[PDB]
Amino acid sequence: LKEVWEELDGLDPNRFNPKTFFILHDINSDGVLDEQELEALFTKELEKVYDPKNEEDDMREMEEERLRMREHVMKNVDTNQDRLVTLEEFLASTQRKEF
Numbered sequence: 001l002k003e004v005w006e007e008l009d010g011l012d013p014n015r016f017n018p019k020t021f022f023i024l025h026d027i028n029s030d031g032v033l034d035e036q037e038l039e040a041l042f043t044k045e046l047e048k049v050y051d052p053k054n055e056e057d058d059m060r061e062m063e064e065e066r067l068r069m070r071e072h073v074m075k076n077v078d079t080n081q082d083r084l085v086t087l088e089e090f091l092a093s094t095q096r097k098e099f
Contacts, residue, residue, distance in 0.1 A: 018094055022087055032086050038073060042066055 025033060025041065046052070046066075052059055079089035093099065 018091075022090070032084050034084050038070070042069055045069075 025037065027037065043066075046059075050059070050062075077085060077090065077093050079085070079093055
């Protein structure tokens with residue numbers, strides 16, 4: 001097992017791969033993400049950072065953050081505004097570098 005300090009050059013043709021991030025987030029494997037998948041993805045992100053329990057206060061003033069994501073995604077990713085995002089139109093919002 002010779003680890004050795006690896007050193008890529010020219011940047012291997014292994015371009016990024018946003019396609020997999022779309023799969024891992026596809027829980028019901030519907031090929032699309034609706035307001036029910038983003039609803040759970042926002043409340044859960046707080047689980048990996050905040051720390052709720054049985055109190056009602058710290059989870060209100062910061063509410064400005066939940067709207068910050070629900071809006072930026074619904075505004076910067078919504079392609080044909082159908083509350084539903086398909087893999088096709090979604091790739092565009094990303095693939096189209098000029099944007």
